[PDB]
Design a protein around this ligand. Structure first.
Ligand SMILES: [K+]
Ligand SMILES: [K+]
Ligand SMILES: [K+]
Ligand SMILES: [K+]
Ligand SMILES: [K+]
Ligand SMILES: [K+]
Ligand SMILES: [K+]
Ligand SMILES: [Mg+2]
Ligand SMILES: [Mg+2]
Ligand SMILES: [Mg+2]
Ligand SMILES: [Mg+2]
Ligand SMILES: [Mg+2]
Ligand SMILES: [Mg+2]
Ligand SMILES: [Mg+2]
Ligand SMILES: [Mg+2]
Ligand SMILES: [Mg+2]
Ligand SMILES: [Mg+2]
Ligand SMILES: [Mg+2]
Ligand SMILES: [Mg+2]
Ligand SMILES: [Mg+2]
Ligand SMILES: [Mg+2]
Ligand SMILES: [Mg+2]
Ligand SMILES: [Mg+2]
Ligand SMILES: [Mg+2]
Ligand SMILES: [Mg+2]
Ligand SMILES: [Mg+2]
Ligand SMILES: [Mg+2]
Ligand SMILES: [Mg+2]
Ligand SMILES: [Mg+2]
Ligand SMILES: [Mg+2]
Ligand SMILES: [Mg+2]
Lengths: 237, 66, 123, 467, 49, 102, 53, 154, 64
RNA sequence: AAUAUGAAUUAAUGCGAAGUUGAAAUACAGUUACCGUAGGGGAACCUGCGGUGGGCUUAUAAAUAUCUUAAAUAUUCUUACA
RNA sequence: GGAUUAAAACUAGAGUAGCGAAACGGAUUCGAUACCCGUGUAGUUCUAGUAGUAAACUAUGAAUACAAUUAUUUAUAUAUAUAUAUAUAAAUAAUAAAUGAAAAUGAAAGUAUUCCACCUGAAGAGUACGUUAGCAAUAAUGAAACUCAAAACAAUAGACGG
RNA sequence: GAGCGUUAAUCAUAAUGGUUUAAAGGAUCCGUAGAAUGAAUUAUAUAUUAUAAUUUAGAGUUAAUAAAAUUAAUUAAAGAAUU
């Protein structure tokens, strides 16, 4: 769509109405808009750095910067065809934001598929309030989950306790297993202790599933019978 | 979605992530402050402010804003 | 056209009116002798008995000239003067005879626009 | 062929001046000052330039680490006193032009702003600070005085503990470095904008223009510039805590409260006889230590100027700095050690303080001579396109955080109103955050008002009294 | 340039004409009783009677 | 709409505007030159307050499209001296006006 | 603006450039030559299965 | 090359229509002189040497090793929702070059159509090349130079 | 429809501009997600309170 | 030999009115039209061969859908809580 | 200037199933030199030639520089937690801008540059005459007079449609 | 207006043009002339041109590596059906 002119120049068109006398009374917005001018450039802006990984955009490595031989054993003595194509488009294309943590996140849930079954709430509370010390995995305010492992791994590599990401990741994974085992026992024991003091429960999870399956299996019984009678008659033909 | 991009918004985009364009909140904040000052000015001047929103669920916000 | 095509002759056609009285040979009028007086039928949607005359000009060209005015005394062998101007509804009649010249008299009892019909001023 | 020391560029209707001496931290020499002074006169005559933006090309490393005094020291050692007086006539004349400039000037203090750098920003009502800002006046350690009209600005713009120029004297005599948010809260910076947002702000400044039939020199346009910057301000860091606690503010307000004929010894007495909290007592000893490692002559000269340029008009204060600078490079009475100290620290790298020799107490007449024009050396400030003088900045107050004297005036007025109402801290915060048009929603304004009431006001019943 | 001064005399040079003030002054010395009226540069043509 | 006018009498410079099939060539004129343009343009200039103008219409001479094209040309094809000066950061001087100034 | 638009290669720079370019051409010729001999060796190993008599 | 200059003039018009803030042009002496005149006249915000990928942040000496990858990067200006550089056209064309004496250049700047060249309009820049230097026509008239009328920018 | 009528009627307009929305159609665009009720209500709330402060400042100047 | 003139003699074509013999074209025009070419026929036209769309893009479903605290809790909330 | 150039046609010699101008018959019809049916010659096939014409069409000459997006394929390259992911070109589809009488075009029918071909109301006419080429059919080149104020394109609303 | 009209003529009155669909892209490509057009840097000259040197972005040559099995001409074969 064409860059519109009439929406941002309401003040100038209105001023012509007032100066000529076509409009007798100044509108209430008139003074406010005059003091706060609209932005009217609507230009495309170049960008020279990917904010996520700090990669520089718009830099060409000259042959003088590649004095040594390549992986093929050949020296570079002239620009290649790619170096001779103008790359202005890269300055204007929104950069693809990338994060190392994304790679670890995909790994964690590939190694632990059932962690996906633990519901996650994507609704944020207040990102600005998060005061986390990742020297430990547990934090007040957030659940224990895969993200706890990833942030712990980053802290280890950031503090240089471990050098390889794999080693830091494995170290964090074991801390995660220990915390998961203490919670699996606290829940089992809490249920056992409550039943031993006379706690009664209406429906268990297993019972809930049986009831839901019965509702479905009852509708399925009717349809099967109906469709095993239309077939018999239709086949009789 | 980046597939639905209207390239005239290029200057507002911070980047693309998970198949969508990420809006630059630093610009959103500056634009928001400017827009807020306009509303305050018109309100303090006695002008008529109309809030238009026709997507489901917006009525409650629209009524209280008015 | 390209610049070189213009150099080779390409250009806008010229606008200049073309001659509609070629038989006069670029003369205001030419004398002639009436070969045969005739009556012709206008092309549609007009209806009338238009008086014309075939004339042999002093240059050998034979033309058809319209006799204007109400009533004429033109006959065969009458000396007439022919000027340019076609009769729109008569195809092929591209000339006019001048009233009040040669043997063609002026329109009888003409009051208005006398100069166009060879009529002298009444005392 | 060489890169110009200062680069001038067009930003729509804004003219950008960029300091281009990265290797020297943008130090200001006579060449830089002269270029900027001449180009600003042209921009003042131009009808297509709405505002000017003074920035650096080295940000966030430094904006201006100070005037080039190391070169002035070599001049003194070579008796090139004419060269030295040219360096100060150019710099001080540029500081006077900026102070009286009729069009908005917006300085981006994105980095070390010390010495001459302070002169480039302190005199502009739009002096923007960032997280990387480092404001300081480290002249007492080099044997010089607080120059670039800092003795006329600081006593008039500081916000806290500056009723009698106590805080102004603390910064000028101790050379304490203030960083980012603290500079904004003290009044050293009019605005606080994140460095990342400076590019966007610069573009917006170039795009705004006076409306209808208003020139860029009208107060209306100055309001527009202030609003434009405010749209780019962001809330202070959550963890941020003001640098000076009330107890530390009480030490400065008492230990640096002198009379019209006070002396550095009087301050030393207060710092040595201070009584109060343990933090205050310990804080007073720290100041005493620092003030005893400075030049004994510079401290006395600084106090003289602060007590002289705090009630005089701008032109006489800047002119008195030119006289003092010239009367110091040419040490006729061997009363100062500016040249020797400058070589000990800058020309030669020596962490240890220069051993001082002029450790006497200059008399009132001696100080008068050092700060008065010699009838043999005629020096005058270059003429600017405004040629105006005044005793109060025409715009600084409107666009910076309020001072402790402005809050007091409203409490006294409100407390003495026919309404017979009670002044409450909540009412004070509302009156400064949601009433004054130019201060509406100003960053860290409620925090400053609460610091003032908690230290200056007495809460009796549902009212406030100005202790 | 944005701060370059341009005045009537500069305009006169651009238009290759005498300054407008000069034209006014030369038009005031035309009256027979006006100051500056002079006519002698033409008395250089040999005539014989 | 408001149309820019140079000295409230003419247009700023020359205009070559294409409105659909209408080719409009409008030239600014000296004071006292009068309106020497297509009759449709003449009426518009009279109402708008343009006194001096020269021009020629090529290709389509449809009255309706000449009128709309002219209005569009006066707004979208003109730039005031002030707007040019501010955009380029330069001073633009009218030599004829300075010649008769003090 | 004052900077020269182009700086000609110094005679030394042209010498080092020629060395690298000659090396590049020579290395590719050698690598192709050795590949052909390695294919001739692998064909000798199987020529006992081929019939010529 | 006048062909290259025609390519650049058309390129700048295309960039103005889409309102890109930064674009590149071929790296040649004529192109650099052309761009520099536009920069000094206020049509271009910035003029930087660079490569095919973008403007250089630090000085990069140009040599035969990298000449093929060099470009000039120019910043376009837009004010009040209008491009400052709206049109850019050649006067002297590759197939019909126009050389004018200083007398005829003065007539062109005075409202007279010379050799079908429409006269200079208010706020328009006409560039002239003389002895391989590019200057404004008004500057050539000041220096009494005769030269080729290259292009007009508005 | 409403935006075009506002232009025709010279009424200044504010709108949330998502990545698929035309910025030039409004006087004061606010770049932001327009599909989430939280994002919309957050931006609307800020604008509404700004209006409230203006209203309170107008009613206060009338009292005093 | 050329140029010009007249010329026995002979070819093509336009307009005008105005009937006649069919109904070729424009809709699927009642056999899709037209292009090139060939043969045939009172006349339009018919037929063969290839080509073109300035005709068929005029294009529009074999249907089937799911479990966590329904509320003393969400739904209320007006600058409050924190 | 040169070369190649569908179908038909022609020259010479082979071939000839099927198809099929023509011709001769059968039907249909008021008539049927047609549409449909039969018998079916040239031709359609091969070899060696002649000829250089088609709605030979994208009814859009070639080259270069340049300009906002999406989708889908293809290719090359890169990476790995090995099958995707990231790049750079090409093709196609739908578009922004721009252009346009509009229909629409969309990387051109946009912004520019260079070179070639071609056009200047309809009808007469791609005709007449001459010339050149060909075995021939023909092909190329290519007018004027007379007459008229017309003639044409895109789109709009109708009417009508076996 | 002592002229007016009319006829015959001259100038002006749109190329600050067009060719998918309205007049108009050559069937196609190859290539000669072109008094057609056409890269970069530097130095001279008598200067948008000339000359010299230098350069590699257009245009080409060879090889390496990978990919593809089409388009011409020719020769040798196969297949369903038809009569
Ligand atoms: K038919
Ligand atoms: K046919
Ligand atoms: K046929
Ligand atoms: K056969
Ligand atoms: K076709
Ligand atoms: K061609
Ligand atoms: K067309
Ligand atoms: Mg009559
Ligand atoms: Mg949305
Ligand atoms: Mg029939
Ligand atoms: Mg029919
Ligand atoms: Mg039919
Ligand atoms: Mg037949
Ligand atoms: Mg057929
Ligand atoms: Mg049809
Ligand atoms: Mg169709
Ligand atoms: Mg045969
Ligand atoms: Mg048959
Ligand atoms: Mg042939
Ligand atoms: Mg033919
Ligand atoms: Mg043909
Ligand atoms: Mg074909
Ligand atoms: Mg080719
Ligand atoms: Mg023929
Ligand atoms: Mg039609
Ligand atoms: Mg007379
Ligand atoms: Mg003409
Ligand atoms: Mg064309
Ligand atoms: Mg073709
Ligand atoms: Mg054709
Ligand atoms: Mg190549």
């Amino acid at each position: 769509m064409k860059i519109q002119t009439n929406a941002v120049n309401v003040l100038q068109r209105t001023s012509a109405y007032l100066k000529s006398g076509l409009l007798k009374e100044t509108p209430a917005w008139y003074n406010v808009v005059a003091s706060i001018p609209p932005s009217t450039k609507f230009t495309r802006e170049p960008r020279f750095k990917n904010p996520s990984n700090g990669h520089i955009i718009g830099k060409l490595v000259d042959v003088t910067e590649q004095p040594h031989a390549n992986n093929k054993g050949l020296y570079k003595t002239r620009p290649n065809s790619s170096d001779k194509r103008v790359g202005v488009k890269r300055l204007y294309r929104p950069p693809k934001l990338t994060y190392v943590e994304d790679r670890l996140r995909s790994l964690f849930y590939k190694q632990h598929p059932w962690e996906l079954s633990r519901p996650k709430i994507l609704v944020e509370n207040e990102i600005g309030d998060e005061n986390y010390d990742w020297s430990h995995m547990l934090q007040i305010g957030r659940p224990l989950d895969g993200e706890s492992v990833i942030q712990r791994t980053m802290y280890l590599i950031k503090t240089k306790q471990y050098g390889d990401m794999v080693e830091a990741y494995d170290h964090a994974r074991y801390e995660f297993y220990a915390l998961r085992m203490q919670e699996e026992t606290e829940q089992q024991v809490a249920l056992e202790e409550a039943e031993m003091f006379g706690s009664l429960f209406g429906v268990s999870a297993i019972e809930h599933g049986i009831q839901k399956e019965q509702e479905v299996l009852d509708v399925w019984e009717k349809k099967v019978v109906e469709e095993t009678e239309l077939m018999a008659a239709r086949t009789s033909n | 979605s980046t597939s639905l991009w209207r390239s005239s918004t290029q200057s507002y985009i911070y980047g693309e992530y998970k198949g969508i364009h990420i809006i630059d909140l630093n610009q959103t904040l500056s634009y928001l402050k400017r827009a807020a000052k306009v509303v305050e000015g018109v309100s303090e001047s006695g002008g008529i402010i109309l809030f238009l929103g026709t997507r489901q669920g917006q009525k409650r916000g629209l009524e209280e804003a008015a | 056209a390209t610049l070189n095509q213009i150099k080779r002759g390409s250009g806008p056609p010229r606008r200049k009116k073309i001659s509609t009285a070629p038989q006069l040979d670029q003369c205001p009028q030419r004398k002639g002798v009436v070969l045969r007086v005739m009556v012709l039928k206008p092309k549609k949607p007009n209806s009338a008995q238009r008086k014309a005359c075939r004339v042999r000009l002093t240059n050998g060209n034979v033309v058809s000239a319209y006799i204007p005015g109400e009533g004429h005394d033109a006959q065969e062998h009458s000396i007439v003067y022919v000027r340019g101007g076609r009769c729109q509804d008569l195809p092929g009649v591209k000339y006019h005879v001048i009233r009040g010249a040669g043997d063609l008299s002026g329109v009888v009892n003409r009051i208005s626009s006398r100069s166009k019909y060879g009529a002298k001023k009444p005392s | 062929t060489d890169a110009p020391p200062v680069l001038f560029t067009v930003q729509d209707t804004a003219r950008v001046i960029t300091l281009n001496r990265p290797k020297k931290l943008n130090a200001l020499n006579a060449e830089m000052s002269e270029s900027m002074f001449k180009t600003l006169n042209e921009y003042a005559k131009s009808d297509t330039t709405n505002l000017v933006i003074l920035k650096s090309s080295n940000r966030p490393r430094s904006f201006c680490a100070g005037g080039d005094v190391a070169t002035v020291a070599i001049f003194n050692f070579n008796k090139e006193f004419a060269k030295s007086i040219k360096f100060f006539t150019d710099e001080y004349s540029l500081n006077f032009q900026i102070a009286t400039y009729l069009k908005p000037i917006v300085t981006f203090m994105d980095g070390i702003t010390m010495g001459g750098g302070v002169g480039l920003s302190i005199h502009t009502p739009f002096r923007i600070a960032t997280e990387n800002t480092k404001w300081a006046m480290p002249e007492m350690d080099i044997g010089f005085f607080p120059d670039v009209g800092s003795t006329f600005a600081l006593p008039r713009i500081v916000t806290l503990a500056n009723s009698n120029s106590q805080m102004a004297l603390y910064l000028c005599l101790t050379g304490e470095v203030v960083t980012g948010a603290d500079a904004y809260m003290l009044g050293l910076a009019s605005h606080y904008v994140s460095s990342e947002n400076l590019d966007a702000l610069q573009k917006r400044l170039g795009e705004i223009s006076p409306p209808f039939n208003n020139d860029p020199q009208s107060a209306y346009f100055f309001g527009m510039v202030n609003e434009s910057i405010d749209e780019f301000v962001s809330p202070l860091p959550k963890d941020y805590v003001f640098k000076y606690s009330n107890e530390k503010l009480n030490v400065i307000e008492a230990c640096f409260n002198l009379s019209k004929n006070g002396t550095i010894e009087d301050i030393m007495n207060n710092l040595r006889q201070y009584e109060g909290s343990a933090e205050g007592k310990a804080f007073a000893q720290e100041i005493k230590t620092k003030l005893l490692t400075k030049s004994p002559s510079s401290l006395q000269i600084a106090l003289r100027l602060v007590q002289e340029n705090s009630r005089d008009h701008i032109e006489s204060a800047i002119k008195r700095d030119l006289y003092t600078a010239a009367n110091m490079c040419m040490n006729q009475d061997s009363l100062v050690e500016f040249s020797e100290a400058t070589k000990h620290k800058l020309i030669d790298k020596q962490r240890v303080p220069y051993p001082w020799t002029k450790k006497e107490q200059l008399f009132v007449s001696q100080l008068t001579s050092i700060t008065s024009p010699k009838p043999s050396l005629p020096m005058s400030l270059l003429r600017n396109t405004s040629n105006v003088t005044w005793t109060q900045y025409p715009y600084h107050s409107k666009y910076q955080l309020p001072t402790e004297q402005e809050i007091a005036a409203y409490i006294e007025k409100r407390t003495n109103d026919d309404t017979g109402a009670k002044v409450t801290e909540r009412e004070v915060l509302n009156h400064f955050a949601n009433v004054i048009p130019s201060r509406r929603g100003k960053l860290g304004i409620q925090s400053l008002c609460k610091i003032v009431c908690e230290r200056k006001c007495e809460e009796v019943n549902d009212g406030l009294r100005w202790k | 340039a944005e701060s370059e001064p341009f005045g009537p005399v500069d305009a006169a040079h651009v238009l290759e004409l005498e300054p407008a003030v000069e034209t006014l002054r030369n038009l005031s010395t035309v009256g027979e009783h006006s100051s500056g009226h002079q006519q002698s540069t033409n008395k250089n043509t040999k005539v014989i009677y | 709409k408001e149309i820019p006018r140079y000295e409230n009498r003419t247009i700023y410079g020359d205009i070559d505007f294409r409105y659909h099939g209408v080719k409009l060539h409008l030239r600014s004129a000296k004071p006292g030159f009068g309106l020497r343009v297509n009759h449709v343009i003449f009426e518009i200039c009279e109402c708008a307050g343009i006194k001096d103008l020269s021009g020629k219409v090529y290709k389509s001479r449809n009255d309706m499209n000449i009128a709309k094209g002219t209005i569009e040309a006066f707004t979208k094809a003109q730039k005031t001296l002030d707007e040019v000066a501010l955009g380029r950061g330069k001073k633009l001087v009218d030599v004829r006006k300075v010649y008769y100034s003090s | 603006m004052s900077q020269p638009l182009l700086r000609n290669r110094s005679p030394e720079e042209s010498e080092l450039l020629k060395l690298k370019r000659n090396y590049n051409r020579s290395l590719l010729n050698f690598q192709a030559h050795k590949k052909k001999l390695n294919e001739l060796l692998n064909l000798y190993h199987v020529a006992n299965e081929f019939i010529v008599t | 090359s006048l062909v290259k200059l025609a390519n650049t003039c058309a390129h700048l018009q295309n960039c103005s229509k889409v309102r890109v803030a930064l674009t590149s042009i071929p790296y040649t002496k004529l192109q650099l002189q052309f761009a520099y005149n536009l920069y000094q006249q206020g049509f271009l915000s910035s003029l930087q040497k660079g490569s095919t990928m973008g403007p250089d942040k630090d000085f990069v000496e140009v040599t035969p090793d990298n000449i093929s990858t060099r470009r000039l990067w120019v910043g376009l200006k837009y004010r009040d929702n209008k491009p400052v550089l709206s049109s850019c056209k050649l006067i002297s064309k590759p197939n019909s070059r126009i050389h004018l004496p200083m007398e005829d250049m003065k007539k062109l700047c005075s409202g007279v159509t010379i050799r079908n060249i429409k006269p200079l309009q208010p706020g328009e820049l006409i560039l002239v090349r003389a002895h391989n230097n590019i200057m404004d026509i008004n500057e050539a008239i000041s220096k009494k130079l005769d030269g080729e009328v290259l292009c007009r920018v508005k | 429809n409403a935006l075009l009528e506002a232009i025709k009627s010279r009424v200044p307009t504010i709108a949330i501009i998502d990545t698929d929305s035309e910025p030039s159609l409004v006087t004061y665009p606010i770049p932001g997600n327009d599909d989430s009720l939280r994002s919309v209500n957050f931006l609307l709330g800020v604008l509404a309170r700004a209006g409230q402060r203006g209203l309170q400042n107008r009613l206060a100047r009338n009292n005093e």
